[PDB]
Design an enzyme around this catalytic site. Structure first.
Site, PDB file in Angstrom:
ATOM      1  N   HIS A 117       1.668  -1.230  -0.122  1.00 29.48           N
ATOM      2  CA  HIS A 117       0.399  -0.148  -0.354  1.00 29.48           C
ATOM      3  C   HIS A 117       0.907   0.971  -0.168  1.00 29.48           C
ATOM      4  O   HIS A 117       0.261   1.956  -0.504  1.00 29.48           O
ATOM      5  CB  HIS A 117      -0.981   0.421   1.445  1.00 29.48           C
ATOM      6  CG  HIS A 117       0.178   0.456   1.989  1.00 29.48           C
ATOM      7  ND1 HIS A 117       0.556   1.455   2.981  1.00 29.48           N
ATOM      8  CD2 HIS A 117       0.891  -1.251   3.352  1.00 29.48           C
ATOM      9  CE1 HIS A 117       0.459   1.375   4.286  1.00 29.48           C
ATOM     10  NE2 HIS A 117       0.387  -0.196   4.647  1.00 29.48           N
TER      11      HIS A 117
ATOM     12  N   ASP B 108      -0.350  -7.513   1.151  1.00 33.18           N
ATOM     13  CA  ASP B 108       0.079  -6.229   1.381  1.00 33.18           C
ATOM     14  C   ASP B 108       1.568  -6.443   1.401  1.00 33.18           C
ATOM     15  O   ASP B 108       2.480  -5.440   2.187  1.00 33.18           O
ATOM     16  CB  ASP B 108      -0.689  -5.551   2.596  1.00 33.18           C
ATOM     17  CG  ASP B 108      -0.399  -4.300   2.252  1.00 33.18           C
ATOM     18  OD1 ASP B 108      -0.705  -3.647   1.016  1.00 33.18           O
ATOM     19  OD2 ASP B 108       0.068  -3.232   3.248  1.00 33.18           O
TER      20      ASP B 108
ATOM     21  N   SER C 238       4.767   2.879   7.550  1.00 36.33           N
ATOM     22  CA  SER C 238       4.391   1.175   7.390  1.00 36.33           C
ATOM     23  C   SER C 238       5.571   1.362   6.446  1.00 36.33           C
ATOM     24  O   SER C 238       6.639   1.881   5.888  1.00 36.33           O
ATOM     25  CB  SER C 238       3.623   1.319   6.475  1.00 36.33           C
ATOM     26  OG  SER C 238       2.424   1.833   6.691  1.00 36.33           O
TER      27      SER C 238
END
Length: 152
Positions: free
Chosen positions: A29, A51, A103
């Site tokens: 993402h 992901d 992230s």
């Protein structure tokens, strides 16, 4: 180093890629270009399920990359923002200690080996549960997502 900023077109940090076991790995993402001349334009393979997207580490970097370990006994672990607790199958941090931009950062043991990659966190009050990717002994990726996870 072995952790790279993933930057948008304005050059703002969106997230992080790491060099690990002969791969560049970043959360899928995380939108942007890894901020390394040797890493920016490799061919990435994308996995929606976990992901995750990854490329082969350029040959230069094979002694640089993190090691992974499947040994995560219950206790405390390290990341850029401080202590990460591992307990009852979950990694947790003080709420406010991680947020958007985080992230892709690794969770590390004191020997400097990766135990997990950070995807996001769910606010549970004092503590935030971390959504992460880990791998088991056979090399299979595992994604752990908690209810009301916020992608970082």
């Amino acid at each position: 180093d072995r952790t790279f900023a993933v930057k948008n077109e304005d050059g703002k940090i969106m997230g992080y890629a790491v060099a690990m076991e002969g791969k560049v790995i970043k959360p899928l993402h995380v939108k942007g270009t890894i901020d390394h001349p040797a890493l920016a334009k490799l061919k990435f393979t994308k996995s929606s399920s976990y992901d995750m997207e990854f490329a082969k580490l350029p040959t230069e970097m094979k002694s640089d990359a993190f090691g992974y370990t499947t040994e995560h006994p219950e206790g405390f672990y390290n990341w850029h923002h401080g202590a990460v607790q591992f307990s009852g199958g979950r990694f947790t941090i003080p709420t406010g200690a991680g947020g958007p931009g985080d992230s892709g950062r690794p969770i590390l043991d004191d020997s400097g080996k990766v135990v997990a990659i950070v995807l996001g966190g769910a606010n549970e009050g004092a503590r935030t549960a971390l959504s992460v990717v880990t791998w088991n002994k056979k090399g299979a990726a595992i994604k752990t997502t908690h209810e009301d996870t916020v992608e970082w």
